[PDB]
Amino acid sequence: NFGSQTPTIVVLKEGTDASQGKGQIISNINACVAVQEALKPTLGPLGSD
Amino acid sequence: ASALLDQALELIQKGIHPIKIANGFDEAAKLAISKLEETCDDISASNDELFRDFLLRAAKTSL
C-alpha cells in the first residue's frame, strides 16, 4: 500500500542454494566419489603418490 | 639423476611399473657400492709425507 511495486516476500536470503528435487543426495555421493578417485590409486605398496 | 630419469622414460614406454624400476636402482646402487668398496685401496699405511701428497692430488682436482 505504501508502494506501487509490492515486492513478493522471499522466504530465504538472496543467493541461497537450491533445495529438494531429484539429485541432491546423488550430488553428495558423486562429490565423495570425486574425492575418492584422487585417493584411489594410492592403495597398497604398488600404488603411487 | 637426469640420466636415471632419461633411461626410465624408455622403460615406462615398455610398461614396467615404477616401483620395480625404483627397486632395481636400489639393488643396483648397493651392488655398485659393495663392489667399489672392495676395489679401492687404503692410504693410512703410508707415512705423513706421502699423505700430504694425496691431499695435493685431490686439491688440484677440486681447484
Nearest CA in chain A to B23: A46
Tell me how the structure was determined. cryo-EM
CA-only gyration radius of chain A, Å: 22
CB contact under 8 A, A45 and B18: no
Asked whether the beta carbons of B33 and B25 are under 8 A apart, the reply is no
Give the span between the Cα atoms of B62 and B43, in whole angstroms: 19
Asked whether the beta carbons of B21 and B11 are under 8 A apart, the reply is yes
In Å, what resolution does this model reach?
A: 3.0
Give the span between the Cα atoms of B15 and A47, in whole angstroms: 15
